[PDB]
Ligand binder design. Structure first.
Ligand SMILES: *[C@@H]1O[C@H](CO)[C@@H](O[C@@H]2O[C@H](CO)[C@@H](O)[C@H](O)[C@H]2NC(C)=O)[C@H](O)[C@H]1NC(C)=O
Ligand SMILES: *[C@@H]1O[C@H](CO)[C@@H](O[C@@H]2O[C@H](CO)[C@@H](O)[C@H](O)[C@H]2NC(C)=O)[C@H](O)[C@H]1NC(C)=O
Ligand SMILES: *[C@@H]1O[C@H](CO)[C@@H](O[C@@H]2O[C@H](CO)[C@@H](O)[C@H](O)[C@H]2NC(C)=O)[C@H](O)[C@H]1NC(C)=O
Ligand SMILES: *[C@@H]1O[C@H](CO)[C@@H](O[C@@H]2O[C@H](CO)[C@@H](O)[C@H](O)[C@H]2NC(C)=O)[C@H](O)[C@H]1NC(C)=O
Ligand SMILES: *[C@@H]1O[C@H](CO)[C@@H](O[C@@H]2O[C@H](CO)[C@@H](O)[C@H](O)[C@H]2NC(C)=O)[C@H](O)[C@H]1NC(C)=O
Ligand SMILES: *[C@@H]1O[C@H](CO)[C@@H](O)[C@H](O)[C@H]1NC(C)=O
Ligand SMILES: *[C@@H]1O[C@H](CO)[C@@H](O)[C@H](O)[C@H]1NC(C)=O
Ligand SMILES: *[C@@H]1O[C@H](CO)[C@@H](O)[C@H](O)[C@H]1NC(C)=O
Ligand SMILES: *[C@@H]1O[C@H](CO)[C@@H](O)[C@H](O)[C@H]1NC(C)=O
Ligand SMILES: *[C@@H]1O[C@H](CO)[C@@H](O)[C@H](O)[C@H]1NC(C)=O
Lengths: 236, 362
């Protein structure tokens, strides 16, 4: 029941400033009131983050995803390499009741969409291997970080109530780990899922690079500030 | 002291001889609650099984399974494990398991074996010679066999070639033994490849129905799935023991701590990467780790030329873990063999923290 649209989803490819967003907890170790220097894959400070206002995009090492969501229009994500039955495809969906994660050789239509009046973006689902159900993830800022290392899919998340008009706030907020998946896939491209009524969405995307950061832990073990060590010389 | 100085005489003073440390008493292991058991009740206690050439295949992964309880059951006629022994199977594990279940005759129970040949072993089910896993068979005459004949069960009898390992074929094509083609109807040279079992309640052992389930394992590079459950002894505090909290091992003494772990951490370290607190996977409370006490020992002597009685000082050790005279506790440690007086004289043999000793007794 998947039909291609007539009008093109030619969202404007704007650019904007990353500022100091996209810092997550590197591990599960408690530290109190200490400065710790760690090297990992992060989003560089004051980088160029792409603004969309839904083509296939490369995955690279990791992905930082952000959305100034109003009324929960985004619904899911699709991950894979060939995006057909030839290779395992990861599908993540968040409907009202719960969240569903599947690893199957789906046959996706060229213009997937969730439909409203459950899933009709794939013609068929065969040879299923992994399934998972959990609580729902979701004027709100939703930030997610997706990483894939040695057969492990790490998803970090954060929700923030914001009231600023247009751009990403000038502030700091660490991302806490959300889910880990022990599944071996070699994802290279991804997509976004929209549940639109048959009768124009904005988000922000950035890529991660390896570098070293200096992190500050307060007394209660929460990350409060960070320093990029490859920037203006003062940072070094 | 004489041995360390390598001499038969000793002058007055304090000397450092050896060291001292507390020895751990016992061991403990802590692991999270055992849950999400693999559902074998629908497999080994299933009402009905499939045909031999249409064996039911089940995929097992992402749960917990204990093989000791299954092995201990006496309801299984044959329990033959080839790759590993059933005892050590509960420790090692694999990234996926395949269960092949069917019903055969009691005389064909040994057909399902590595390097085995036969009608069933070549037309219905085939195993590799290097097969690793286990086979469990049990009689079901009172259940599978019927007084009117268990003709529902079927087996493959005719096929041009054999079967590959882990291959299932349910084709019902009319077998052509001879060269005469058949138009879908069996003739002189054509027979049905499939024949029905003839089980009865009274048929004898060997002709009785037998349910057989074969478990095989595979280790693809994917993260490890189901393993045997891990036992968890209780925890003891205020005693120098060694611990294995969820794969984090170390010695020390465990106490109650008031640190507040944010709801996703597991353990904490202070600086220079030394663990200080842990969270027990069952009670979900923060503990504290302190290294077991140690320190050097020293001997205070007035000289071999004068006497032969000495005093002993344990450095930086509380007077609670000493292992026959009065015992004194000082800011420098604990001291045995000397008497504490209220006077104050000139210092003879320095001890530390503002006190020292001399010979009078010591
Ligand atoms: C949202 O998705 C969940 C996940 O599939 C749905 O919950 C399941 O719905 C099916 C269909 O009746 C049931 O068979 C399952 O038992 C349900 N799972 C659970 C855990 O209850 C849910 O119905 C979906 N809701 C909407 C509005 O689409
Ligand atoms: C259908 O799924 C099976 C298993 O889920 C896949 O079989 C695997 O194939 C790879 C290819 O080399 C082997 O390395 C594995 O050992 C096989 N078994 C596993 C992963 O359990 C099969 O490839 C899948 N088919 C398609 C078209 O994706
Ligand atoms: C860190 O944890 C401490 C300990 O609870 C928090 O301090 C309490 O904060 C509440 C609300 O701000 C006060 O009502 C209590 O009186 C505080 N108690 C103490 C002992 O300080 C603190 O707020 C937490 N956060 C930070 C940034 O320190
Ligand atoms: C593991 O299971 C035990 C057994 O139920 C849990 O212990 C119970 O914890 C609740 C919560 O305080 C108490 O009300 C019960 O009295 C406890 N019973 C027993 C027998 O210990 C324990 O909390 C579980 N641990 C988990 C789920 O991490
Ligand atoms: C050696 O250990 C004992 C036992 O813990 C210590 O005595 C404790 O001292 C503190 C501080 O005054 C009290 O709060 C405790 O109640 C005492 N415990 C007992 C059982 O009496 C003693 O202080 C330790 N030695 C040193 C030098 O601190
Ligand atoms: C991103 O790069 C474009 C040119 O490629 C530039 O005009 C824009 O200012 C940049 N955005 C930043 C640095 O935030
Ligand atoms: C993904 O593809 C690469 C080659 O493109 C291969 O080396 C790797 O093993 C694949 N990933 C998995 C999980 O098989
Ligand atoms: C089958 O049921 C019997 C009867 O309680 C029980 O002893 C046995 O453990 C069960 N086996 C499985 C696999 O559930
Ligand atoms: C102690 O040494 C002095 C001088 O060498 C000596 O006169 C005295 O006898 C010694 N005391 C003994 C051997 O008990
Ligand atoms: C003298 O020493 C004894 C034991 O060494 C002690 O109990 C007492 O408090 C000290 N002071 C006085 C005034 O007795």
């Amino acid at each position: 029941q998947c039909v291609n649209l007539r009008t093109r989803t030619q969202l404007p490819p704007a650019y904007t400033n990353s500022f100091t967003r996209g810092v997550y907890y590197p591990d599960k170790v408690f530290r109190s009131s200490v400065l710790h220097s760690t090297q990992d894959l992060f989003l560089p400070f004051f980088s160029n983050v792409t603004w969309f206002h839904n083509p296939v995009l490369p995955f690279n090492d990791g992905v930082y995803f952000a959305s100034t969501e109003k009324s929960n229009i985004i619904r899911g994500w699709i991950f894979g390499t060939t995006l057909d039955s030839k290779t395992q495809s990861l599908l993540i969906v968040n409907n009202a009741t719960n969240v569903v994660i599947k690893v199957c050789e789906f046959q996706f239509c060229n213009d997937p969409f969730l439909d409203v009046y459950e899933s009709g973006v794939y013609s068929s689902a065969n040879n299923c291997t992994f399934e998972y159900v959990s609580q729902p993830f979701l004027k709100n800022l939703r930030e997610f970080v997706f990483k894939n290392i040695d057969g492990y899919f790490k998803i970090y998340s954060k929700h923030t109530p914001i009231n600023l008009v247009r751009d990403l706030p000038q502030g700091f907020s660490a991302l806490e780990p959300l889910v880990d998946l022990p599944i071996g896939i070699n994802i290279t491209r991804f997509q976004t899922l929209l549940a639109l009524h048959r009768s124009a969405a904005a988000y922000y995307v950035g890529y991660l690079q390896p570098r070293t950061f200096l992190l500050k832990y307060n007394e209660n073990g929460t990350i409060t500030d960070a320093v990029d060590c490859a920037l203006d010389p003062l940072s070094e | 002291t004489k041995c360390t100085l390598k001499s038969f005489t000793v002058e007055k003073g304090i000397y450092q001889t050896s060291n001292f440390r507390v020895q751990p008493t016992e061991s403990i292991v802590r692991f999270p609650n055992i849950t999400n058991l693999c559902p074998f009740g629908e497999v080994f206690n299933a009402t009905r099984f499939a045909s031999v050439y249409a064996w039911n295949r089940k995929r097992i992964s992402n749960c917990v399974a204990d093989y000791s309880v299954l092995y201990n059951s006496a309801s299984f006629s044959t329990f033959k494990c080839y790759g590993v022994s059933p005892t050590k199977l509960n420790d090692l594990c694999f990234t996926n398991v395949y269960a092949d279940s069917f019903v055969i005759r009691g005389d064909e129970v040994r057909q399902i074996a590595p390097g085995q040949t036969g009608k069933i072993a070549d037309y219905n089910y085939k195993l590799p010679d290097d097969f690793t896993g286990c086979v469990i068979a049990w009689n079901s005459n009172n259940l599978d066999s019927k007084v009117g004949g268990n003709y529902n069960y079927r087996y493959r009898l005719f096929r041009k070639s054999n079967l590959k390992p882990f291959e299932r074929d349910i084709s019902t094509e009319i077998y052509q033994a001879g060269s005469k083609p058949c138009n879908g109807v069996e003739g002189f040279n054509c027979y049905f490849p499939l024949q029905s079992y003839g089980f009865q309640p009274t048929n004898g052992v060997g002709y009785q129905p037998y349910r057989v389930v074969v478990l095989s394992f595979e280790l693809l590079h994917a993260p490890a799935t189901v393993c045997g459950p891990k036992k968890s002894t209780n925890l003891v505090k205020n005693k120098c023991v060694n611990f294995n909290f969820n794969g984090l091992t170390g010695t020390g003494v465990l106490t109650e701590s008031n640190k507040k772990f944010l709801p996703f951490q597991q353990f904490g370290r202070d600086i220079a990467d030394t663990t200080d607190a842990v969270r027990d996977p069952q009670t979900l409370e923060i503990l504290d780790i302190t290294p077991c006490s140690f320190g050097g020992v020293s001997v205070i002597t007035p000289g071999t030329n004068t006497s032969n009685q000495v005093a002993v000082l344990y450095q930086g050790v509380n007077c609670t873990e000493v292992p026959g005279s009065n015992v004194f506790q000082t800011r420098a440690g604990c001291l045995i063999g000397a008497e504490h007086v209220n006077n104050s004289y000139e210092c003879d043999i320095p001890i530390g923290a503002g006190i020292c000793a001399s010979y009078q007794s010591i």
